[PDB]
Amino acid sequence: QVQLVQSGAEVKKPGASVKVSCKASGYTFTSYWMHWVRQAPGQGLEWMGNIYPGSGGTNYAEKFKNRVTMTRDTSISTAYMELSRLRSDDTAVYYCARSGGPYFFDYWGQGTLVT
């Protein structure tokens, strides 16, 4: 079984920044794209961006491109997402999810609550 294990919940002050981790195991971490989707109030789920562990290459939705940054560490099979200059509206559960190919999010992280 593959497991995507994220960092524990966090509470943040307006303007502050949060760095959420996502360690994967069970499959070849560097061969699948890693996406971050968030579950925010009256916004259901929304894609935030993604990164390829193997190339470190990224893509960010415009809605967050001026505040987010995604990175990864292949030596510890982990991906990170930093959402800077936080505000009330960012109060949401953050998820990482790898994509399969013919379909997308087949494996999800347990989620990281940020208030």
Partner: protein
């Protein structure tokens, strides 16, 4: 940046009777490669979202036959013939054809 619209937004189901959720994209969503990346996800109470259907009508491995999807071009629909207790949760359609991928607002199913 396609706008996916689900209807209804609330779907109280009587344990045993079929249910249905519609989803319409603001524009055609079949990829140049011919694949329409339309997917349905279910987020059961308190759990991470999970993949139910992909490529419009293909059930993901492990997903019961009760679920099924259909549609084409711009209109899609999920069908939960015979809803069970563990089917409650928020359902979302999603398109991955266009950048950026986008989800519907979510339909809440409760018995």
């Amino acid at each position: 940046d396609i706008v996916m619209t689900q209807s209804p937004l609330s779907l109280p189901v009587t344990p045993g009777e079929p249910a249905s959720i519609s989803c319409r994209s603001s524009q055609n969503i079949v990829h140049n490669n011919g694949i329409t990346y339309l997917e349905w996800y279910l987020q059961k109470p308190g759990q991470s979202p999970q993949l139910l259907i992909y490529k419009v009508s293909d059930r993901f491995s492990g997903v019961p036959d009760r679920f099924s999807g259909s549609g084409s071009g711009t209109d899609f629909t999920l069908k939960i013939s015979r809803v069970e207790a563990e089917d409650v949760g928020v359902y979302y359609c999603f398109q991955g054809s266009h950048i950026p991928p986008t989800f519907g607002q979510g339909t809440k199913v409760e018995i």
